[PDB]
Amino acid sequence: SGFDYEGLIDSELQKKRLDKSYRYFNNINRLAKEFPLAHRQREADKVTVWCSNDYLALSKHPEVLDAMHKTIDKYGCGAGGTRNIAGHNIPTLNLEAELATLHKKEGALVFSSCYVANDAVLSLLGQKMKDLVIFSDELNHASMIVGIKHANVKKHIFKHNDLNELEQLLQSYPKSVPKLIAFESVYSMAGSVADIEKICDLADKYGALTFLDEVHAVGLYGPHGAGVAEHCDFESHRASGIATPKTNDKGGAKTVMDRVDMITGTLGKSFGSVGGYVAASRKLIDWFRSFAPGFIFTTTLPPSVMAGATAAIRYQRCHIDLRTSQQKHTMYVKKAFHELGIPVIPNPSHIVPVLIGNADLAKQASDILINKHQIYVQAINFPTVARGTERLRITPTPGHTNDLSDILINAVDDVFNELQLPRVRDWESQGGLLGVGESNLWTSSQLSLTNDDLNPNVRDEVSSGIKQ
Amino acid sequence: SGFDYEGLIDSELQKKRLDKSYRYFNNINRLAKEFPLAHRQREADKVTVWCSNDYLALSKHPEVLDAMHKTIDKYGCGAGGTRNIAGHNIPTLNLEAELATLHKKEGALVFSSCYVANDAVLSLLGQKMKDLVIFSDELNHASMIVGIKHANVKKHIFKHNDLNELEQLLQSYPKSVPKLIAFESVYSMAGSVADIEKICDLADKYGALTFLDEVHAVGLYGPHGAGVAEHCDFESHRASGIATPKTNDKGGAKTVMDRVDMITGTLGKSFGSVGGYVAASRKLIDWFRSFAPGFIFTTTLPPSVMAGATAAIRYQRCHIDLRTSQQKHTMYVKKAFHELGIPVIPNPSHIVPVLIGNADLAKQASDILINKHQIYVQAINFPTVARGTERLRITPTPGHTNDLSDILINAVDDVFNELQLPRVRDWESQGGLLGVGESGFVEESNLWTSSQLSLTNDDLNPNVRDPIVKQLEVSSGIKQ
Ligand SMILES: CC(C)(COP(=O)(O)OP(=O)(O)OC[C@H]1O[C@@H](n2cnc3c(N)ncnc32)[C@H](O)[C@@H]1OP(=O)(O)O)[C@@H](O)C(=O)NCCC(=O)NCCSC(=O)CCC(=O)O
Ligand SMILES: Cc1ncc(COP(=O)(O)O)c(C=O)c1O
Ligand SMILES: Cc1ncc(COP(=O)(O)O)c(C=O)c1O
Ligand SMILES: [Mg+2]
Numbered sequence: 001s002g003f004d005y006e007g008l009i010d011s012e013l014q015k016k017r018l019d020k021s022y023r024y025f026n027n028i029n030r031l032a033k034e035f036p037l038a039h040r041q042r043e044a045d046k047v048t049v050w051c052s053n054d055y056l057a058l059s060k061h062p063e064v065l066d067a068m069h070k071t072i073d074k075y076g077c078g079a080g081g082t083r084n085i086a087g088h089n090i091p092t093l094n095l096e097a098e099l100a101t102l103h104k105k106e107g108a109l110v111f112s113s114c115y116v117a118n119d120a121v122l123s124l125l126g127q128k129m130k131d132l133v134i135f136s137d138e139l140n141h142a143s144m145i146v147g148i149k150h151a152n153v154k155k156h157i158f159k160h161n162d163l164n165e166l167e168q169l170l171q172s173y174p175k176s177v178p179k180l181i182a183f184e185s186v187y188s189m190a191g192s193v194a195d196i197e198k199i200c201d202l203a204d205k206y207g208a209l210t211f212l213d214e215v216h217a218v219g220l221y222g223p224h225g226a227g228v229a230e231h232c233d234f235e236s237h238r239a240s241g242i243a244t245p246k247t248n249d250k251g252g253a254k255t256v257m258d259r260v261d262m263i264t265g266t267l268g269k270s271f272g273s274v275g276g277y278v279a280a281s282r283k284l285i286d287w288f289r290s291f292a293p294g295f296i297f298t299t300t301l302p303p304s305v306m307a308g309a310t311a312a313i314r315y316q317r318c319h320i321d322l323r324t325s326q327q328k329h330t331m332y333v334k335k336a337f338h339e340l341g342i343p344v345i346p347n348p349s350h351i352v353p354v355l356i357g358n359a360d361l362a363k364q365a366s367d368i369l370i371n372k373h374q375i376y377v378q379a380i381n382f383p384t385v386a387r388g389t390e391r392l393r394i395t396p397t398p399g400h401t402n403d404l405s406d407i408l409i410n411a412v413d414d415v416f417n418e419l420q421l422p423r424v425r426d427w428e429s430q431g432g433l434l435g436v437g438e439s440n441l442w443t444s445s446q447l448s449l450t451n452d453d454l455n456p457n458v459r460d461e462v463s464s465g466i467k468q
Numbered sequence: 469s470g471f472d473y474e475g476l477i478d479s480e481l482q483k484k485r486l487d488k489s490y491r492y493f494n495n496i497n498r499l500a501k502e503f504p505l506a507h508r509q510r511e512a513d514k515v516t517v518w519c520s521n522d523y524l525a526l527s528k529h530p531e532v533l534d535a536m537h538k539t540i541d542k543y544g545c546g547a548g549g550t551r552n553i554a555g556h557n558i559p560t561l562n563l564e565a566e567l568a569t570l571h572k573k574e575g576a577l578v579f580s581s582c583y584v585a586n587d588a589v590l591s592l593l594g595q596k597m598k599d600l601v602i603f604s605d606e607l608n609h610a611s612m613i614v615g616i617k618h619a620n621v622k623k624h625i626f627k628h629n630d631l632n633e634l635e636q637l638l639q640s641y642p643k644s645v646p647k648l649i650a651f652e653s654v655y656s657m658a659g660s661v662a663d664i665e666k667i668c669d670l671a672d673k674y675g676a677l678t679f680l681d682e683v684h685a686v687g688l689y690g691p692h693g694a695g696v697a698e699h700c701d702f703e704s705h706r707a708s709g710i711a712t713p714k715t716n717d718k719g720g721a722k723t724v725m726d727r728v729d730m731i732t733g734t735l736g737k738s739f740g741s742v743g744g745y746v747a748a749s750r751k752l753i754d755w756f757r758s759f760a761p762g763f764i765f766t767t768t769l770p771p772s773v774m775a776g777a778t779a780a781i782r783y784q785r786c787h788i789d790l791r792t793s794q795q796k797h798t799m800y801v802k803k804a805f806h807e808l809g810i811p812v813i814p815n816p817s818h819i820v821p822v823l824i825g826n827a828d829l830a831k832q833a834s835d836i837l838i839n840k841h842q843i844y845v846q847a848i849n850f851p852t853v854a855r856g857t858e859r860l861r862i863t864p865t866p867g868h869t870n871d872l873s874d875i876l877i878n879a880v881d882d883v884f885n886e887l888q889l890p891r892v893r894d895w896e897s898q899g900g901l902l903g904v905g906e907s908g909f910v911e912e913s914n915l916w917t918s919s920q921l922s923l924t925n926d927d928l929n930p931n932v933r934d935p936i937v938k939q940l941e942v943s944s945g946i947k948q
Contacts, residue, residue, distance in 0.1 A: 001677030003597075003646040009755045012596060016758055023758070025556035032544035053767075054548035064545050068772070069537060076500035077532050077776040078740045080522030085846040085861070086710040088493035112580045112742075114785040115766040128480065129471075150618065178471040207470025268767030274580075283477045290484055290491070297610040298583040299521075299736030302773055304536070308545040378553045393553075404498045465492035468485050 020359060020384065028376060032060035035399045038376065047374040048396050050408060055350065056219050056322045058312040059272035071307035079300035083289075087300035088464065095267075095306040096463045097279050098313045102218075102226045103263050104244055104255075107285035107462040110306070111295055114215055114266035114276030118143040119150060120294040121211070121262060121278055122182065124287070126151020129178045135208070136184040137161070137167055139196070144182055144213060160187075163198055170206035179208035181193040185228035186216040189385055189393070190434065191347030193441060195295040197232055200259045209261045219270025220326065221441055223449070224317045224458060229263065230443055232256035241455025247335055262329035270316065273309040275301050285462045318458040320449055325398040326350055327442045329405060333396055336409045345391065346435040353380075354412065355436050356421060362390040365415050371406060373411035389434060474588060488827055489850055500528035503506065506844065508519055511559040515842040518876060520864050523818065524687050524790045525741030525867040540720060547768035551757075551917060555768030563735075563774040566781045567745050569696050570686075572712050572723075573733050575753035575942040579763055579773070582683055582734035582744030586611040588760040589679070589730060590650065594619020596759075597646045603637055603676070605629070605651040605662070605706045606684055612650055612681060618931040621749035628655075638674035647676035653696035654684040657853050657861075658902060659815030664697055668727045677729045687738020688794065688818055689915055691923070692785045692932060697731065699915055700724035711930025738784065741777040743769050750942050757942070786932040788923055793866035794818055795916045799872065801864055804877045809891035810884060813859065814903040816912045820862035821848075822880065823904050824889060830858040833883050841879035857901065 010046050012381050016022040028049065036049045058064055071091060081087030092110065099108035111117040122144065126132055134148050134155040148155055158165040166181070173179065181203055183194050201254065203210045214227035222230025223238035224237045230237050233255045236245035248255045257263075262284065267275035278288065289295060316322050329351045337354070345353040356362035362379035369375040369392075377392045385391065392412075396405070416423065427437030484490040496517065499505045503525050504517045526532055539559060549555030560578065567576035579585040590612065594600055602616050602623040616623055626633040641647065649671055651662050664680065671678045682695035690698025691706040692919045698705050701723040704713035716723045725731075730752065735743035746756065757763060785789050805812045805822070812899070813821040822845075824830040830847035837843040837860075845860045853859065860880075864873070884891065890898075892905050900906025941947075 001643045003644055005646065005677060006751060008596065009751050013754060013758060022945065023552055024947075025551055025943070026554075027556060027558065027561070027944070028549075028554055029557050030543055030548055030554075032540070032542060046579070049554060052548040053556045054546060059546040059548050060544035065540055067814050068540055068545055070498075072533055072536055074500060076497060076528040076740070077536055077773070077780075078522060078527040078736055078742060080498055080520040080527050080737075080740070081496075083493055084491055086498075086517060086520040086844070087498055088495060090495065093495070111764045112584065115762060116580065119762075129476070139725065142761050146761055175470045178473070209473060242870050266767060268546055269548075272544070272548070274546055274767055274773075283474060283481070286481060290481065293610045293614055294583060298581045299734060299742050302770075305545070305742075305770055305773065312545075376554070394716050411561075423727050463493070465490065465493070467492070468490075 028378070030059070035060050036397065036404070047376045048404060048407070049376045050400070051376060051378040053269040053395060054272055055270045055326065055395060056272070056316055057397045058270065058316065060310065061272065061315065063311045064272055064308045067307040067311035067316065068304045074302040077302055077304070079109060079303060081300065082296065082298060082393060083104040083300055084296060086316055087124055087305060091303040091310070092300065093463055095310045096211070098310050099265070101242065102136025102224065102313060102317065103257060103279040104226070105263070105279040106282040108279040109276050109285050109295065110301065111276045112298055112301065113268065113274065114213070114264055115143040115268050116294050117264050117276035117278050118213065119147040120292040120386060121288060123150040123266065123294070124292050125180055125209070126153040128291070129153070132178045132180060133173060134182055135166060138414070139187050139189070140182060140184060141213065144221065147300070148182065161192060163202065166199070167202055170202055170208065173206070174205045179206060180211055181208050182211040184213040184215070185221070186349050188216045188351065189380060190345045190353050191351035193228060193348055193351035196229055196260065197256050200256060210259070211262045212260045213264050215266045215269065216390040218265040218322060219316055223320055223454060225270065225323060226257065227265070228441065229257035229260055234446060239340070240456065241457045243457065246412055267309040270366045271309045271312040273305050273308060273312065275305065279390055281460050286466060289462065305409050318454055319451060320454060321451055322398050323442070324447050324449065326396060327447055329396040329398065329400045332402060333394065333405050333409065336405070337412070340409065340413050340424055342412055343422065343424045343427055343436040348440045350395065352396065354392040354394060355427070356390050356392065357433065359387070359390045361419055362392060362422060365392060365421065368415050369411060373414070375408055375411050455460060475777060483809065483850035492582055494838070494844070500526070500533070502529050504865065507766060513644065515844045516872060516875070517844045518763060518864070518868070519844060519846045520865070521737040521863060522740055523738045523794065523863060523865055524740070525785055525865045526738065528786065529740060529780065529783065531779040532740055532776045535770045536776040539772040543771040545772070546770055549768060550764065551768055552764065553771060554691040557771055559774040559778070560768065560941050562937070563622050563778045564745070564943045565937045565939050566778050567733070567747055569710065569935070569937050570785065571747040572694070573731070573747040574750040575940055576745050576747040577753050577756050577763065578769065579744045580766055580769065581736065581742070581921050582681070582732055583611040584762045585732050585744035585746050586681065587615040588762040589732065589756060590615025591618040592756060592760055593648055593677070596622040597621070600646045600648060601641060602650055603634060605656070607655050608650060608652060609681065609683070616650065629660060629662060630668065630739060631663060634667070635670055638670060638676065641674070643675040647674060648679055649676050650679040652681040652684070654817050656684045656819065657848060658813045658821050659817035659819035660814055661696060661912070665724050667701055668724060669908040672920045678727070679730045681732050681734070682727045683734045683737065687784055691788055691928060693738065693791060694725065695733070696915065697728055697730070702920060706928065709931045711931065735777040735921070739777045739780040741773050741780060743773065743777060753942050753947060776822065780878040787925060788928060789917070789925055790866050792921050792923065794864060795914070795921055797864040797866065797868045799914070800870060801862065801873050801877065805880070808877065808881050809893060810880055811892045811895055811904040814909070814911045816914045818863065820864065822860040822862060823895070824858050824900065825856060825901070827855070827858050829887055830860060831899055832887060833860060833889065836883050836886060837879060841882070843876055843879050850865065890903065
């Protein structure tokens with residue numbers, strides 16, 4: 001009689017096993033007193049973590065931990081409500097104010113996660129403008145893909161960073177048609193970067209809104225870690241600090257960061273906590289707040305988790321040493337790999353993707369690294385990346401000092417030898433792949449700045465609704 | 469002249485202001501050292517919180533706070549990754565095991581929130597069964613509505629708890645058609661309860677899966693706070709404790725909790741933290757884990773927040789005093805309101821919805837209560853509730869002792885007088901509404917009976933206290 005629900009689930013699972021995309025999770029317990037070590041199942045088995053997105057190691061920062069401990073003593077664990085009922089509070093007000101200050105926007109709105117933030121904003125735009133056309137970069141994150149599907153409007157996918165194709169799509173609509181350009185600043189799987197300035201120019205010309213996911217950039221780019229949008233006018237922002245610059249880096253009236261309509265970020269990476277946000281105009285923020293179901297009808301994040309994020313954001317804002325440090329640690333690993341002929345996918349960012357080119361060998365490498373060498377690096381396979389371009393993702397932080405880097409370099413070299421993995425010159429002979437075998441965002445001048453080169457002012461209503 | 473984006477936003481906002489559904493938030497800072505007080509903008513301005521969903525006051529429980537503090541010292545703040553990469557850990561394994569133990573299911577899966585959990589599970593069911601027909605209760609939560617929309621399949625909305633209409637809809641399809649019945653155990657806006665047993669019977673007959681949101685029940689119903697599904701076989705579960713009962717409360721083979729395919733809950737109410745989950749079979753859990761994008765592609769919750777929830781769950785499991793206490797505090801307020809003719813929407817649960825019937829007057833009441841009387845109660849308006857049925861939501865907890873209750877009762881009475889709000893007799897004269905002033909309405913008896921309310925922690929099975937809860941292979945993936 002009845003539909004065979006068990007059989008459908010059995011064979012859907014078995015499909016994932018045969019194509020070998022069935023994932024086994026790793027028991028990884030990060031130690032706050034011993035960054036970036038972690039223990040496995042037993043506390044005795046420790047490993048060095050080289051694939052975390054705790055990019056600035058702020059998850060274990062004293063000011064973050066102190067903020068949590070002190071906030072727990074006063075507020076407890078849960079918020080005990082939503083923003084509409086019993087879950088609106090000062091830690092929330094401070095976190096939203098910080099995020100708005102960071103991107104120098106009129107307002108910011110916090111959600112459970114950036115996944116939720118992206119889904120909420122993209123959903124709402126498409127639901128309230130049925131005529132909207134969304135232009136989405138090929139390599140956008142799952143959350144943006146889902147948000148665009150949920151938007152339920154027309155969409156065009158442009159080839160990765162191909163702004164010719166973007167302009168061709170934009171041009172084919174009248175100017176009066178509402179449009180959204182949705183893209184990331186830094187793409188995490190090989191560390192490519194968007195030309196935000198040129199996209200804003202396109203948006204001005206064809207009358208589009210811009211939606212920029214800076215998830216892999218906040219903390220990391222710009223003098224204050226406000227992202228690649230800030231970095232685009234690095235000197236203007238560094239000179240003005242907290243304040244809006246009088247001009248951009250070309251003497252024009254508005255910065256790239258000012259011109260982007262909507263910037264989303266996470267609290268769960270550089271900022272060492274959990275949560276997501278969008279920063280935008282007062283009007284946009286009030287709009288999302290008043291209509292987004294994924295904002296309204298869910299428990300507010302714990303006060304302590306917000307306090308933690310807020311401290312992480314305040315601290316990194318005026319500690320450019322975090323960024324120069326991380327950039328230097330990255331360059332150090334990249335350069336060492338280059339000398340050993342360990343194939344790194346070239347990129348101008350903080351990520352170190354090591355090309356393997358085979359799913360099995362990458363998984364096998366991952367395993368030997370953790371079991372033989374106590375190095376935790378994750379293998380990236382289909383469908384995150386194209387089949388044949390599988391890789392190890394390595395993400396250095398300020399805490400990966402050169403001693404730790406040396407151990408990694410030696411370990412990776414050993415594994416390449418053990419499994420007879422291709423070196424750079426083996427890729428060269430096959431015509432190259434993704435840059436391997438055939439210009440950093442951080443310049444030398446920028447990398448030699450210290451905290452003394454920041455503006456003193458970076459040291460020390462829409463969130464609630466507006467009356468009418 | 470491109471599209472006027474600012475003007476569209478301006479007029480969409482202005483629409484919310486004129487219909488008076490534009491919400492202003494209140495700055496409410498809950499004090500863990502003085503439950504259930506909170507301060508406003510200034511620490512000096514304190515108020516009593518009467519509308520929190522921290523139903524058992526476990527947000528400030530010593531075992532919860534200790535678990536957080538100790539977990540932070542070891543793990544830090546963020547998990548620093550997703551479940552696939554660097555964000556799988558022991559606090560996660562323990563939390564999922566506890567949730568599976570609570571609902572006596574083979575597995576459980578933790579998400580950012582129950583909103584996400586609902587959206588993920590409903591989305592996936594409809595995406596992998598395009599032929600699915602979903603039968604959804606009228607009053608389902610926004611998260612379930614969104615999840616059903618995203619499921620992108622056929623749906624029928626049956627009138628609230630009308631299982632005649634449900635059966636009529638179910639009947640009109642062949643048995644072989646895949647079907648889902650999606651409903652809540654306790655509905656939060658007037659505290660109604662579903663006949664879960666009869667819905668499971670319907671599901672057996674017409675070949676449907678059941679999806680049960682127990683968000684407003686976990687912590688509160690059943691001997692161990694496993695929800696209304698547990699309460700349905702209260703004695704069977706109480707006798708067996710942690711273990712699966714040999715029989716249900718009618719001597720039959722399977723409990724109501726066993727028969728429900730998928731149960732979702734929150735960690736953000738009774739369990740005093742944040743997060744969501746689904747409990748179900750090993751196969752269903754592994755399925756969601758392997759395919760749900762809202763599970764896969766997001767940072768894992770902080771270890772400390774999971775540890776907190778886990779402690780909250782372990783503690784309440786063997787502390788039925790939390791439930792009897794709360795039930796008694798609720799009954800006390802309800803009975804006092806009944807004597808003063810303050811119109812409470814009758815219900816067999818822990819919620820105390822005070823009927824006002826006008827959006828402005830409910831907001832006005834809310835304001836006088838907090839400013840004049842230092843009582844924080846929230847007004848519920850359209851679209852959360854039907855226009856003309858606006859109300860104040862009051863949710864007592866074990867911490868709302870009778871002294872606090874007395875002050876509330878007096879305050880609400882004073883405000884009813886100040887604004888000349890309708891009393892029960894005034895509703896009687898308008899024919900009644902939702903049970904208030906409706907002669908020959910026969911109330912559903914409270915879920916908690918006298919016999920159940922007089923149980924103590926000594927009446928629970930010893931095996932629910934400090935149980936060794938083994939971790940689950942399905943939380944990590946299954947070898948074979
Ligand atoms: C297995 C596939 C091919 C996906 O599976 P399928 O082929 O079954 O899916 P599909 O045909 O794409 O159907 C799913 C829907 O995704 C949509 N879709 C795909 N790419 C899109 C984009 N950039 N913007 C908007 N929508 C997009 C398709 O149009 C389709 O919508 P319709 O149904 O309306 O046609 C995988 O390789 C994949 O991930 N493809 C998406 C493109 C990609 O490279 N994504 C980056 C993943 S990496 C990640 O998450 C990290 C990214 C980062 O941090 O930068
Ligand atoms: C019945 C019901 N389910 C789910 C939710 C959402 O759960 P969470 O707060 O865990 O996102 C709520 C919140 O209002 C609810 O009332
Ligand atoms: C580019 C990008 N956007 C969005 C997200 C989602 O952020 P969250 O972890 O806060 O849900 C991620 C997560 O990895 C991401 O990499
Ligand atoms: Mg206020």
